Amino acid sequence: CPRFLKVKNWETEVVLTDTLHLKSTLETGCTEYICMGSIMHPSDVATKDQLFPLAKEFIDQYYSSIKRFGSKAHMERLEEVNKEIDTTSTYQLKDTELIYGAKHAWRNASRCVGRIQWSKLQVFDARDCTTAHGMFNYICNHVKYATNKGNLRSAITIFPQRTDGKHDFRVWNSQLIRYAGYKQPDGSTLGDPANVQFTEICIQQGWKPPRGRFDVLPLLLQANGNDPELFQIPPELVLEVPIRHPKFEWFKDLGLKWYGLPAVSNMLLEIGGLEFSACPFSGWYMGTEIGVRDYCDNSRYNILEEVAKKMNLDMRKTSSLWKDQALVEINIAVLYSFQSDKVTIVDHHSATESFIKHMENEYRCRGGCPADWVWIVPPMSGSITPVFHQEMLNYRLTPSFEYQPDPWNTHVWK
Amino acid sequence: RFLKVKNWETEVVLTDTLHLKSTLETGCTEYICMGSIMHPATKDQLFPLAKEFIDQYYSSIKRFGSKAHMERLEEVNKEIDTTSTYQLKDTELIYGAKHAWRNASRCVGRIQWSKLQVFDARDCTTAHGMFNYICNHVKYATNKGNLRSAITIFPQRTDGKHDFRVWNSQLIRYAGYKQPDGSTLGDPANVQFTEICIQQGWKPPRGRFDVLPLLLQANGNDPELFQIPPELVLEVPIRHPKFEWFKDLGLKWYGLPAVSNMLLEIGGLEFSACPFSGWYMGTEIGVRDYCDNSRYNILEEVAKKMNLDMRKTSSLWKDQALVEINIAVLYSFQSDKVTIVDHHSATESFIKHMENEYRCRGGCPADWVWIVPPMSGSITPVFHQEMLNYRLTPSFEYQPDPWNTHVW
Ligand code: HEM
Ligand code: HEM
Ligand SMILES: CCOc1ccc(-c2ccc3c(C)cc(N)nc3c2)cc1CN
Ligand SMILES: CCOc1ccc(-c2ccc3c(C)cc(N)nc3c2)cc1CN
Ligand SMILES: C[C@H](O)[C@H](O)[C@H]1CNc2nc(N)[nH]c(=O)c2N1
Ligand SMILES: C[C@H](O)[C@H](O)[C@H]1CNc2nc(N)[nH]c(=O)c2N1
Ligand SMILES: [Zn+2]
């Protein structure tokens, strides 16, 4: 690499200079001769000697941020951690470092358009948790807090870190709140097709399914390497929104609703070499996540045709753009419904405008902002949002959120 | 290693081996991805490039290592020695131009790549001659609405002071004017070019859709102005199948998309004038040309006549207006029997093209950022299609705008 890299916005001609990319850590999958920018996931513990430089890197960074770099406290903190690694093969983050790391993993999340909010994250320290019941307790408190009767607040709950890899804490759910999917014998799918596999695991562990279209899944929670356990989220904690349209009376007749709180629970949080395998986090929805993907993906709820039929569109040509017309109304309904019920939501125009402002500010104050164009650009109306025209650099900074294998493919059953 | 690409909607997985044959750089590194950056020889360097190309050509016709193959190499070697350059056989030129299209990672239309009419204009010596070839091209490609893919190839670069250039970015494009009050009349993307043409003697009608003159440079001389015979320029008035008031907007567009400012690289040879043309995907006009902020910017006006709530962005009034404009564009072209393709059919075809290419070639370079349409992305099949991007040659390359380089 060279020291400086420029990016240009083709709509406004603004040019930004990236220096932060020099602090890049892991690989991207790309080389000089091939780019993997549209590959979803490009490509057991760590040793003592693997861990010293990783912890030091994070500690320096942290003390650099609080304007105390090379201080007495900095050096004493380093001495402490180095001994702890030497005598236990791991170490413990202070409460302040854990909070710094969690906020910075969000800040460094190149596929997140919502990062203008990164510094307003409520961090719940759950490192004292020992059992699955305890996890359930922590998670209920998270959901209630974050939901806040519609006034959603971003939060993250962090469970104890990996030790030897045989005592992992995991949320088996991919999100804290999701709807169930039931593969029918006739090949059809009732509910959310994305969650069919997880639903079956839940039923096997003893879940009694209502077998409806929008059944909130049970939490499946694993503590300290033990077999996972099922708990029902109290229903009064799950905020939902029926979907209606500001002009089409019949839209309520489709019987659609969604949950208010998006809370991913299957990713891994990496801070200074430590691996927090259970770290559910939540913010609020962008309209299209629900309106476009969850509702109109062919392999999700796939309602485009049924909506188009009631709109009385011509559906035999594709050049009538009947799909495109229905899609827009669907997203109008979603936004209308959330707004009317005073539940926090952002439309893709507002969110993308905010990200550009956020990204410019990060370039001035931080020397860059990793961003994944393929993910940052919304799934509809791409070129009429300002991110479409913005050049972006992608690279991996630490602390960070990573993907991790599904726990059922790994778990050694007790 | 072999690499896999998965379509997440159909779960189809293809295996890429073609990338191993790639030789040009992409712009990325192991640490930084530049997938969304728009723009990331002497005797000595020339023969290996020449040899590589001739090798792959004779490979393509199943005569690799033949007598003809060796003799061709010897011929190209001796010619590079004695002249510092070499000339391509007619067949090599046609193979070359088709494969530059085939390798064009940003092009969603490559299912058509081997159906390409190639006009060899390498005997051309003057701007007038260029004008001639270009009119013949436009007439052939337009074909009274039944558009036919073509490219016209002018003489290759030599010492770099005798370049052939088409100064237009496209053969047919509308003028753009800087108004006294600051606004722009017409296409803002062409305001600078329009000013260069007026500086050179062009008398502008100063309307919203004025077809620009050709500005042709031959052998490195000052460019010259030419008027395309108006009977060769096919245009479509844009009207809407439900909204009768839409014609009142007075929008039109030209039928023939003909990019003329790029460089064709074959076997180490640089062709700096090589205008090529196909037909439009609707969104190119109905999303980008009409609704970009820096373009004609008509969303607001259309949403007015649709009488939508334009106070909040969360009414998605822009999105609604946008779909209607693209309905109008498709509807108008089809009613005028002018070849056009909607982004659903075109992305569907590309997925099928990928399938064929992985089968017969062991891969297909594709730029996901450019292949996904600028509206309704995830309801087209390419959104969910993983792609590998890498640079194969022959290729189309960007080159600097001529006015930054030329000395008059
Ligand atoms: C508060 C408002 C937020 C908004 C509007 C928002 C928006 C989004 C969207 C739209 C995506 C892409 C999801 C998709 O299309 O599939 C995304 C990705 C992501 N976000 Fe945010 N998000 C928010 C909060 C957060 C928070 C609080 C965190 C972490 C503390 C976070 C971390 C991430 C990560 C790690 C991804 C990438 C997920 C992946 O790799 O699949 N986000 N965000
Ligand atoms: C026949 C119908 C064709 C269709 C529907 C088509 C479609 C497209 C589209 C939609 C783009 C993206 C343009 C943009 O969004 O700005 C594109 C780019 C491109 N097309 Fe095709 N194309 C066709 C024919 C051709 C031909 C005949 C050639 C050359 C022989 C060609 C070479 C290219 C190249 C090199 C690009 C990339 C432009 C760049 O890198 O700046 N296309 N095409
Ligand atoms: C393609 C499926 O993969 C994802 C898709 C979306 C997200 C994700 C993750 C976090 C979010 C958050 C925190 C807020 C929000 N509005 N949307 C979010 C979306 C995560 C993942 C990772 N499993
Ligand atoms: C800054 C954007 O640059 C481009 C974008 C698109 C194209 C292009 C090039 C050829 C096309 C062809 C041949 C057909 C078609 N329908 N669209 C085409 C579009 C060229 C260029 C290069 N001037
Ligand atoms: C193939 C492609 O990489 C994949 O479908 C991506 C494209 N961009 C995306 N962008 C967002 N925000 N979310 C996604 O799930 C995806 N999916
Ligand atoms: C920043 C980004 O690379 C740039 O705006 C690209 C994005 N994708 C595109 N895709 C197409 N087909 N045409 C374009 O001009 C662009 N512009
Ligand atoms: Zn890359």
Tab-separated table of N, CA, C and O in Angstrom, chain A residues 1 5 11 21 24-28 30-35 38-41 292-293 297-298 317-321 324-325 328-329 331-332 335 339 347-349 373-374 379 381-383 391-395, chain B residues 3 8-9 22-26 28-34 36-38 287-288 293 313-316 319-320 323-324 326-327 330 334 342-344 368-369 374-378 383 386-390:
chain	number	residue	atom	x	y	z
A	1	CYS	N	0.815	-1.212	0.000
A	1	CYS	CA	0.000	0.000	0.000
A	1	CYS	C	0.857	1.276	0.000
A	1	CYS	O	2.049	1.241	0.325
A	5	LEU	N	-4.873	7.251	0.343
A	5	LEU	CA	-5.813	6.727	-0.632
A	5	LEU	C	-6.994	7.684	-0.749
A	5	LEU	O	-7.564	8.084	0.260
A	11	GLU	N	-21.416	12.440	-7.413
A	11	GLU	CA	-22.574	13.321	-7.479
A	11	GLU	C	-22.238	14.738	-7.019
A	11	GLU	O	-22.823	15.705	-7.504
A	21	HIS	N	-6.623	3.272	6.779
A	21	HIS	CA	-6.472	1.930	6.206
A	21	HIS	C	-5.131	1.285	6.558
A	21	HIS	O	-4.931	0.078	6.366
A	24	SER	N	-5.335	-1.353	9.156
A	24	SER	CA	-6.046	-2.561	8.726
A	24	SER	C	-5.354	-3.820	9.263
A	24	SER	O	-4.138	-3.864	9.342
A	25	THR	N	-6.122	-4.847	9.621
A	25	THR	CA	-5.548	-5.976	10.353
A	25	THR	C	-5.597	-7.306	9.612
A	25	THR	O	-4.560	-7.909	9.342
A	26	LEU	N	-6.801	-7.773	9.308
A	26	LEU	CA	-6.977	-9.071	8.666
A	26	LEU	C	-7.109	-8.921	7.156
A	26	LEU	O	-7.096	-7.810	6.625
A	27	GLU	N	-7.259	-10.052	6.482
A	27	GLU	CA	-7.394	-10.095	5.038
A	27	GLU	C	-8.834	-9.830	4.596
A	27	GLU	O	-9.765	-9.886	5.399
A	28	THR	N	-9.005	-9.532	3.311
A	28	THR	CA	-10.315	-9.215	2.752
A	28	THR	C	-10.828	-10.330	1.850
A	28	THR	O	-12.024	-10.400	1.557
A	30	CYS	N	-9.639	-10.357	-1.113
A	30	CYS	CA	-9.191	-9.777	-2.375
A	30	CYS	C	-7.689	-9.882	-2.521
A	30	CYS	O	-6.977	-9.923	-1.520
A	31	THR	N	-7.217	-9.929	-3.770
A	31	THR	CA	-5.797	-9.784	-4.077
A	31	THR	C	-5.574	-8.725	-5.155
A	31	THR	O	-6.502	-8.028	-5.576
A	32	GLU	N	-4.335	-8.619	-5.616
A	32	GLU	CA	-4.015	-7.707	-6.691
A	32	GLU	C	-4.719	-8.155	-7.976
A	32	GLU	O	-4.968	-7.350	-8.870
A	33	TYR	N	-5.070	-9.437	-8.051
A	33	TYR	CA	-5.593	-9.993	-9.296
A	33	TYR	C	-7.015	-10.536	-9.228
A	33	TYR	O	-7.488	-11.132	-10.188
A	34	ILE	N	-7.702	-10.315	-8.110
A	34	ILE	CA	-9.101	-10.719	-8.000
A	34	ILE	C	-9.785	-10.006	-6.845
A	34	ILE	O	-9.172	-9.762	-5.807
A	35	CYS	N	-11.053	-9.655	-7.037
A	35	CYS	CA	-11.818	-8.961	-6.014
A	35	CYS	C	-13.001	-9.804	-5.570
A	35	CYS	O	-13.717	-10.351	-6.401
A	38	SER	N	-18.269	-9.096	-3.421
A	38	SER	CA	-19.683	-9.481	-3.427
A	38	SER	C	-19.883	-10.920	-2.938
A	38	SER	O	-20.983	-11.457	-3.021
A	39	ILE	N	-18.797	-11.537	-2.469
A	39	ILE	CA	-18.822	-12.795	-1.727
A	39	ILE	C	-19.338	-12.580	-0.295
A	39	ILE	O	-18.802	-11.751	0.448
A	40	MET	N	-20.360	-13.334	0.098
A	40	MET	CA	-21.012	-13.106	1.394
A	40	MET	C	-20.090	-13.409	2.589
A	40	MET	O	-19.933	-12.572	3.478
A	41	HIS	N	-19.471	-14.587	2.607
A	41	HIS	CA	-18.500	-14.910	3.658
A	41	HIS	C	-17.161	-15.379	3.079
A	41	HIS	O	-16.944	-16.583	2.961
A	292	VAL	N	-38.488	-4.642	1.752
A	292	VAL	CA	-37.931	-5.247	0.545
A	292	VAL	C	-37.501	-6.693	0.748
A	292	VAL	O	-38.033	-7.600	0.116
A	293	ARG	N	-36.547	-6.908	1.643
A	293	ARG	CA	-35.974	-8.235	1.825
A	293	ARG	C	-36.942	-9.207	2.543
A	293	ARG	O	-37.384	-10.191	1.936
A	297	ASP	N	-38.305	-10.818	-0.888
A	297	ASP	CA	-37.411	-11.896	-1.295
A	297	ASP	C	-38.268	-13.103	-1.658
A	297	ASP	O	-39.265	-13.387	-0.977
A	298	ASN	N	-37.889	-13.800	-2.729
A	298	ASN	CA	-38.614	-14.989	-3.161
A	298	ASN	C	-38.539	-16.102	-2.109
A	298	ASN	O	-39.503	-16.846	-1.918
A	317	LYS	N	-46.593	-9.150	-18.641
A	317	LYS	CA	-45.299	-8.600	-19.037
A	317	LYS	C	-44.476	-8.395	-17.774
A	317	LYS	O	-45.044	-8.214	-16.698
A	318	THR	N	-43.150	-8.410	-17.880
A	318	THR	CA	-42.353	-7.908	-16.761
A	318	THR	C	-42.031	-6.439	-17.016
A	318	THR	O	-41.766	-5.683	-16.083
A	319	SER	N	-42.090	-6.025	-18.281
A	319	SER	CA	-41.805	-4.636	-18.632
A	319	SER	C	-42.934	-3.682	-18.206
A	319	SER	O	-42.816	-2.472	-18.382
A	320	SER	N	-44.017	-4.211	-17.638
A	320	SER	CA	-45.014	-3.346	-17.000
A	320	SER	C	-44.488	-2.813	-15.672
A	320	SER	O	-45.027	-1.853	-15.136
A	321	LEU	N	-43.412	-3.432	-15.181
A	321	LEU	CA	-42.791	-3.121	-13.892
A	321	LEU	C	-43.796	-3.251	-12.752
A	321	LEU	O	-43.795	-2.454	-11.812
A	324	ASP	N	-42.053	-3.785	-9.527
A	324	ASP	CA	-41.452	-2.563	-9.014
A	324	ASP	C	-42.505	-1.667	-8.352
A	324	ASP	O	-42.240	-1.037	-7.326
A	325	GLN	N	-43.702	-1.635	-8.925
A	325	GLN	CA	-44.774	-0.813	-8.375
A	325	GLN	C	-45.252	-1.325	-7.014
A	325	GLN	O	-45.368	-0.555	-6.065
A	328	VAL	N	-42.808	-0.721	-3.998
A	328	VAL	CA	-42.823	0.628	-3.449
A	328	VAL	C	-43.975	0.812	-2.448
A	328	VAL	O	-43.769	1.319	-1.338
A	329	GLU	N	-45.174	0.375	-2.833
A	329	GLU	CA	-46.339	0.479	-1.946
A	329	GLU	C	-46.124	-0.314	-0.658
A	329	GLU	O	-46.464	0.154	0.428
A	331	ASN	N	-43.360	-0.940	0.825
A	331	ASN	CA	-42.451	-0.205	1.692
A	331	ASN	C	-43.081	1.061	2.230
A	331	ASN	O	-42.685	1.554	3.289
A	332	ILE	N	-44.078	1.575	1.517
A	332	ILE	CA	-44.820	2.728	2.001
A	332	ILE	C	-45.642	2.312	3.216
A	332	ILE	O	-45.694	3.025	4.226
A	335	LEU	N	-43.362	1.729	6.463
A	335	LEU	CA	-43.009	3.009	7.065
A	335	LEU	C	-44.206	3.710	7.714
A	335	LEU	O	-44.094	4.280	8.808
A	339	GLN	N	-44.466	4.373	11.785
A	339	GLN	CA	-44.592	5.777	12.170
A	339	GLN	C	-45.881	6.033	12.942
A	339	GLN	O	-45.874	6.737	13.951
A	347	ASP	N	-36.351	5.579	7.080
A	347	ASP	CA	-36.461	5.275	5.663
A	347	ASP	C	-35.058	5.287	5.043
A	347	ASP	O	-34.139	5.927	5.556
A	348	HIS	N	-34.892	4.573	3.947
A	348	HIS	CA	-33.577	4.457	3.313
A	348	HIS	C	-32.989	5.791	2.784
A	348	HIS	O	-31.774	5.922	2.681
A	349	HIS	N	-33.826	6.777	2.460
A	349	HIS	CA	-33.304	8.088	2.061
A	349	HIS	C	-32.633	8.798	3.230
A	349	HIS	O	-31.490	9.258	3.119
A	373	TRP	N	-19.732	-1.051	0.102
A	373	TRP	CA	-20.712	-0.509	-0.855
A	373	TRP	C	-21.840	-1.496	-1.154
A	373	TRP	O	-23.010	-1.126	-1.158
A	374	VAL	N	-21.473	-2.750	-1.405
A	374	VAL	CA	-22.432	-3.806	-1.722
A	374	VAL	C	-23.506	-3.966	-0.643
A	374	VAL	O	-24.658	-4.339	-0.949
A	379	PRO	N	-31.539	-1.976	-0.927
A	379	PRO	CA	-31.998	-2.990	-1.888
A	379	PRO	C	-33.021	-2.513	-2.924
A	379	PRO	O	-33.327	-3.268	-3.847
A	381	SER	N	-34.241	1.357	-5.162
A	381	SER	CA	-33.967	2.777	-5.390
A	381	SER	C	-32.502	3.198	-5.184
A	381	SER	O	-32.232	4.281	-4.680
A	382	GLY	N	-31.570	2.326	-5.553
A	382	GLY	CA	-30.157	2.549	-5.313
A	382	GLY	C	-29.580	3.896	-5.736
A	382	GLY	O	-29.052	4.634	-4.897
A	383	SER	N	-29.675	4.235	-7.027
A	383	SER	CA	-29.034	5.465	-7.515
A	383	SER	C	-29.709	6.767	-7.059
A	383	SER	O	-29.150	7.841	-7.252
A	391	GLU	N	-17.687	6.644	-3.651
A	391	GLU	CA	-16.642	5.620	-3.634
A	391	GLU	C	-16.332	5.251	-2.183
A	391	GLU	O	-16.299	6.123	-1.329
A	392	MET	N	-16.112	3.968	-1.910
A	392	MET	CA	-15.803	3.522	-0.544
A	392	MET	C	-14.618	2.560	-0.497
A	392	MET	O	-14.490	1.680	-1.340
A	393	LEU	N	-13.762	2.726	0.501
A	393	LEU	CA	-12.730	1.735	0.809
A	393	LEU	C	-13.224	0.724	1.833
A	393	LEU	O	-13.845	1.082	2.841
A	394	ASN	N	-12.948	-0.546	1.578
A	394	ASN	CA	-13.276	-1.573	2.552
A	394	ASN	C	-12.039	-2.260	3.103
A	394	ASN	O	-11.157	-2.692	2.352
A	395	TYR	N	-11.987	-2.351	4.426
A	395	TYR	CA	-10.901	-3.018	5.122
A	395	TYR	C	-11.336	-3.342	6.554
A	395	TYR	O	-12.315	-2.791	7.064
B	3	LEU	N	-12.157	-21.346	-7.210
B	3	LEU	CA	-13.021	-20.573	-6.317
B	3	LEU	C	-14.497	-20.830	-6.623
B	3	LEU	O	-14.860	-21.074	-7.766
B	8	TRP	N	-27.480	-17.060	-3.719
B	8	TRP	CA	-28.109	-17.325	-2.434
B	8	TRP	C	-29.604	-17.563	-2.556
B	8	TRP	O	-30.224	-18.137	-1.673
B	9	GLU	N	-30.180	-17.149	-3.670
B	9	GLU	CA	-31.584	-17.412	-3.917
B	9	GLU	C	-31.755	-18.854	-4.420
B	9	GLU	O	-32.532	-19.617	-3.867
B	22	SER	N	-5.922	-14.909	-15.525
B	22	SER	CA	-5.983	-13.450	-15.561
B	22	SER	C	-4.601	-12.845	-15.329
B	22	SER	O	-3.785	-13.428	-14.620
B	23	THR	N	-4.327	-11.690	-15.936
B	23	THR	CA	-2.975	-11.123	-15.884
B	23	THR	C	-2.921	-9.657	-15.469
B	23	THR	O	-1.892	-9.185	-14.981
B	24	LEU	N	-4.018	-8.937	-15.670
B	24	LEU	CA	-4.087	-7.535	-15.271
B	24	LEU	C	-4.586	-7.387	-13.826
B	24	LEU	O	-5.324	-8.240	-13.328
B	25	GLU	N	-4.175	-6.304	-13.164
B	25	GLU	CA	-4.522	-6.044	-11.762
B	25	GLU	C	-5.914	-5.428	-11.589
B	25	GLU	O	-6.439	-4.787	-12.501
B	26	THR	N	-6.501	-5.628	-10.409
B	26	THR	CA	-7.890	-5.238	-10.150
B	26	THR	C	-8.021	-3.930	-9.371
B	26	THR	O	-9.031	-3.240	-9.484
B	28	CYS	N	-7.521	-3.906	-5.939
B	28	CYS	CA	-7.560	-4.338	-4.542
B	28	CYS	C	-6.206	-4.816	-4.081
B	28	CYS	O	-5.283	-4.935	-4.884
B	29	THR	N	-6.096	-5.071	-2.778
B	29	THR	CA	-4.971	-5.785	-2.177
B	29	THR	C	-5.507	-6.746	-1.112
B	29	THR	O	-6.709	-6.792	-0.854
B	30	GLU	N	-4.623	-7.500	-0.470
B	30	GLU	CA	-5.066	-8.440	0.569
B	30	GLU	C	-5.721	-7.730	1.746
B	30	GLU	O	-6.515	-8.325	2.463
B	31	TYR	N	-5.402	-6.452	1.921
B	31	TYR	CA	-5.882	-5.683	3.062
B	31	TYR	C	-6.980	-4.679	2.732
B	31	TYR	O	-7.718	-4.268	3.618
B	32	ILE	N	-7.085	-4.259	1.475
B	32	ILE	CA	-8.049	-3.221	1.124
B	32	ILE	C	-8.807	-3.570	-0.151
B	32	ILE	O	-8.205	-3.879	-1.180
B	33	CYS	N	-10.133	-3.531	-0.084
B	33	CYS	CA	-10.948	-3.779	-1.263
B	33	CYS	C	-11.369	-2.452	-1.850
B	33	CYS	O	-11.796	-1.552	-1.120
B	34	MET	N	-11.228	-2.343	-3.169
B	34	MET	CA	-11.577	-1.143	-3.909
B	34	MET	C	-12.653	-1.433	-4.920
B	34	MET	O	-12.719	-0.796	-5.973
B	36	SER	N	-15.526	-0.584	-5.306
B	36	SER	CA	-16.441	0.483	-5.727
B	36	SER	C	-15.722	1.755	-6.180
B	36	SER	O	-16.358	2.789	-6.340
B	37	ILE	N	-14.405	1.689	-6.365
B	37	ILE	CA	-13.677	2.786	-6.996
B	37	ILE	C	-13.890	2.734	-8.512
B	37	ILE	O	-13.672	1.693	-9.137
B	38	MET	N	-14.321	3.842	-9.105
B	38	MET	CA	-14.687	3.815	-10.522
B	38	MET	C	-13.477	3.609	-11.448
B	38	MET	O	-13.557	2.818	-12.393
B	287	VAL	N	-33.673	5.894	-15.026
B	287	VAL	CA	-33.175	6.101	-13.672
B	287	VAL	C	-32.001	7.083	-13.618
B	287	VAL	O	-32.048	8.091	-12.908
B	288	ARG	N	-30.955	6.771	-14.375
B	288	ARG	CA	-29.706	7.530	-14.345
B	288	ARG	C	-29.773	8.844	-15.151
B	288	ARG	O	-29.563	9.934	-14.600
B	293	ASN	N	-29.249	13.510	-9.914
B	293	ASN	CA	-29.233	14.908	-9.502
B	293	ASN	C	-28.440	15.764	-10.456
B	293	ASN	O	-28.841	16.877	-10.787
B	313	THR	N	-39.675	12.585	3.229
B	313	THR	CA	-39.013	11.604	2.377
B	313	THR	C	-39.624	10.220	2.590
B	313	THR	O	-39.545	9.360	1.710
B	314	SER	N	-40.252	10.016	3.752
B	314	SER	CA	-40.752	8.694	4.117
B	314	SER	C	-42.091	8.350	3.451
B	314	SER	O	-42.650	7.285	3.695
B	315	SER	N	-42.598	9.246	2.610
B	315	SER	CA	-43.701	8.914	1.708
B	315	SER	C	-43.193	8.175	0.452
B	315	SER	O	-43.975	7.676	-0.349
B	316	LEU	N	-41.875	8.122	0.302
B	316	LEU	CA	-41.219	7.453	-0.825
B	316	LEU	C	-41.756	7.981	-2.153
B	316	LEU	O	-41.873	7.243	-3.137
B	319	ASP	N	-39.482	7.338	-4.975
B	319	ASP	CA	-39.515	5.947	-5.437
B	319	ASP	C	-40.701	5.651	-6.367
B	319	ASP	O	-40.567	4.940	-7.364
B	320	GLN	N	-41.852	6.208	-6.029
B	320	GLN	CA	-43.052	6.088	-6.833
B	320	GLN	C	-42.889	6.748	-8.193
B	320	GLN	O	-43.055	6.097	-9.212
B	323	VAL	N	-40.511	4.754	-10.536
B	323	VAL	CA	-41.074	3.591	-11.209
B	323	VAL	C	-41.950	4.021	-12.404
B	323	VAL	O	-41.932	3.375	-13.453
B	324	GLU	N	-42.698	5.113	-12.258
B	324	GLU	CA	-43.561	5.571	-13.347
B	324	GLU	C	-42.758	6.075	-14.564
B	324	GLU	O	-43.142	5.836	-15.711
B	326	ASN	N	-39.812	5.063	-15.499
B	326	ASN	CA	-39.251	3.888	-16.163
B	326	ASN	C	-40.310	3.050	-16.886
B	326	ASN	O	-39.998	2.358	-17.861
B	327	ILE	N	-41.555	3.106	-16.411
B	327	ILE	CA	-42.662	2.510	-17.153
B	327	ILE	C	-42.857	3.277	-18.464
B	327	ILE	O	-43.052	2.682	-19.514
B	330	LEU	N	-39.946	2.421	-21.086
B	330	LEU	CA	-40.153	1.118	-21.700
B	330	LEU	C	-41.371	1.109	-22.644
B	330	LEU	O	-41.333	0.515	-23.715
B	334	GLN	N	-41.119	0.549	-26.841
B	334	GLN	CA	-41.768	-0.635	-27.376
B	334	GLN	C	-42.835	-0.258	-28.397
B	334	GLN	O	-42.976	-0.917	-29.425
B	342	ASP	N	-35.815	-4.412	-20.443
B	342	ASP	CA	-36.052	-4.026	-19.076
B	342	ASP	C	-35.022	-4.757	-18.205
B	342	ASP	O	-34.441	-5.770	-18.611
B	343	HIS	N	-34.789	-4.223	-17.016
B	343	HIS	CA	-33.730	-4.715	-16.158
B	343	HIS	C	-34.041	-6.112	-15.598
B	343	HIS	O	-33.126	-6.835	-15.201
B	344	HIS	N	-35.314	-6.501	-15.576
B	344	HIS	CA	-35.666	-7.859	-15.148
B	344	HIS	C	-35.227	-8.887	-16.185
B	344	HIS	O	-34.557	-9.870	-15.860
B	368	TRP	N	-20.141	-6.876	-9.572
B	368	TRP	CA	-21.460	-6.855	-8.905
B	368	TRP	C	-21.984	-5.430	-8.742
B	368	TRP	O	-23.141	-5.153	-9.018
B	369	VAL	N	-21.105	-4.521	-8.330
B	369	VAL	CA	-21.440	-3.110	-8.202
B	369	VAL	C	-22.078	-2.499	-9.472
B	369	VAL	O	-22.984	-1.668	-9.375
B	374	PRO	N	-29.741	0.046	-10.973
B	374	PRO	CA	-29.821	1.165	-10.030
B	374	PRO	C	-31.202	1.343	-9.370
B	374	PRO	O	-31.366	2.286	-8.601
B	375	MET	N	-32.171	0.481	-9.679
B	375	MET	CA	-33.426	0.424	-8.915
B	375	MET	C	-33.855	-1.024	-8.767
B	375	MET	O	-33.417	-1.878	-9.531
B	376	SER	N	-34.708	-1.304	-7.787
B	376	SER	CA	-35.284	-2.641	-7.645
B	376	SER	C	-34.214	-3.750	-7.632
B	376	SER	O	-34.416	-4.838	-8.166
B	377	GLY	N	-33.067	-3.443	-7.046
B	377	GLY	CA	-31.940	-4.353	-7.018
B	377	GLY	C	-32.272	-5.750	-6.528
B	377	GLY	O	-32.086	-6.710	-7.278
B	378	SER	N	-32.811	-5.881	-5.311
B	378	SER	CA	-32.964	-7.225	-4.745
B	378	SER	C	-34.121	-8.017	-5.335
B	378	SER	O	-34.199	-9.221	-5.116
B	383	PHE	N	-28.825	-9.561	-7.734
B	383	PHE	CA	-28.536	-9.078	-6.376
B	383	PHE	C	-28.024	-10.245	-5.504
B	383	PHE	O	-27.063	-10.107	-4.731
B	386	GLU	N	-23.441	-14.223	-6.206
B	386	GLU	CA	-22.066	-13.880	-5.880
B	386	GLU	C	-21.306	-13.798	-7.201
B	386	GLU	O	-21.601	-14.530	-8.138
B	387	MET	N	-20.353	-12.883	-7.279
B	387	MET	CA	-19.563	-12.719	-8.484
B	387	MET	C	-18.087	-12.576	-8.155
B	387	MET	O	-17.721	-11.996	-7.137
B	388	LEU	N	-17.243	-13.117	-9.027
B	388	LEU	CA	-15.814	-12.878	-8.955
B	388	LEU	C	-15.385	-11.900	-10.043
B	388	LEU	O	-15.702	-12.088	-11.236
B	389	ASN	N	-14.652	-10.867	-9.639
B	389	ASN	CA	-14.130	-9.920	-10.616
B	389	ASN	C	-12.612	-10.002	-10.765
B	389	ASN	O	-11.870	-10.149	-9.782
B	390	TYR	N	-12.177	-9.939	-12.018
B	390	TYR	CA	-10.780	-10.051	-12.403
B	390	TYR	C	-10.628	-9.583	-13.865
B	390	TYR	O	-11.590	-9.617	-14.626
